[PDB]
Amino acid sequence: LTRSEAAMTVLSGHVVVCIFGDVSSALIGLRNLVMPLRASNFHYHELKHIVFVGSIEYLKREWETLHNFPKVSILPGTPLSRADLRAVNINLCDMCVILSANQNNIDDTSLQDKECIL
């Protein structure tokens, strides 16, 4: 979903997953997050739309595991950019999950959650 068409699409009561990942970043298992949200004890009208905001290069590595789910959208961009957040209707979402997808960062420990805090 590009910015214009994501803005054109209306998203209410959805889930926005903001991930900080690169090509060389470690692969967190995103299937372990989407799969409990599609548990077959929720009616198809009760399923929550999941929009991934992050690098498309990173999400290409996990789409091979995520492509078998009903309603998942991707907005290539940056979680720290207000344009993408406004385009995905962040104020109307049910939940925003800020994930440290670049968890493999080796630095001073306290400066490992800098992106999440920002």
Backbone angles phi, psi at 13, to 5 degrees: 60, 40
**CA 91 and chain centroid, separation:** 15
Task: Map tokens 């290539």 to a residue.
Answer: 76
- The edge-to-edge listing of strands for the beta sheet with 72-76 is 72-76, 50-54, 15-19, 95-99
Query: Between 68 and 81, whose beta carbon lies closer to another protein?
Result: 81
**Contact positions with another protein (CB under 8 A) in 53-82:** 81-82
Query: Between 83 and 92, whose beta carbon lies closer to another protein?
Result: 83
Closest distance between another protein and the C-beta of residue 77, in Å?
11
Position 33: which residue type?
A: L
Q: How many residues bind another protein (CB under 8 A)?
A: 3
Query: Between 74 and 87, whose beta carbon lies closer to another protein?
Result: 87
Instruction: Give the residues lining the site for another protein (CB under 8 A).
Output: 81-83
